[PDB]
Amino acid sequence: YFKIYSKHTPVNLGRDLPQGFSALEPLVDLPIGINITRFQTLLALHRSY
Amino acid sequence: RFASVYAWNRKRISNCVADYSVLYNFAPFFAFKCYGVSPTKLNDLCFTN
Amino acid sequence: KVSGNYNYLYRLFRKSKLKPFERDISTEIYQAGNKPCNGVAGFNCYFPL
Ligand SMILES: *[C@@H]1O[C@H](CO)[C@@H](O)[C@H](O)[C@H]1NC(C)=O
């Protein structure tokens, strides 16, 4: 049941981490049954700026 | 001076500190198939005879 | 089976304890003893299944 708590921003002003309170709303989950080794990420390397 | 197969030579063993970790190097052990009980974990069992 | 049903295998040797509700399929060799086990499977090497 992969936790995907998330929430969009109404009034971000473009500065790093503005102060305030806002919660998150789950959407879906998925069972996995494996253990923890490491993590990795990757964006779409066909275009970057 | 080991005995023959039809009349094999016996042995009795009683109160004694047993450590099954000294015979491994003393013989080549071409065949080392013991009983189904865990061959690796043999230093954690207590018996009366 | 009249000879033996060699379709079921059970794991015997593991490094440590096991958490609830996970699977540990791993076709490996037990790296026991001082000598580096290289799939020898003889003495001081063990096939966990
Ligand atoms: C736990 O994660 C490690 C990291 O790779 C892995 O080697 C190990 O097999 C995992 N545990 C099980 C029971 O599969």
Side-chain angles (χ1 to χ4, degrees), chain B residues 16-20 43:
Chain B
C16 67
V17 176
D19 200 345
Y20 312 148
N43 274 315

Side-chain angles (χ1 to χ4, degrees), chain A residues 9-31:
Chain A
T9 177
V11 290
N12 271 335
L13 73 165
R15 287 81 187 177
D16 284 330
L17 287 169
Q19 312 283 8
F21 285 99
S22 299
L24 318 173
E25 298 85 348
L27 317 171
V28 298
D29 290 327
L30 183 63

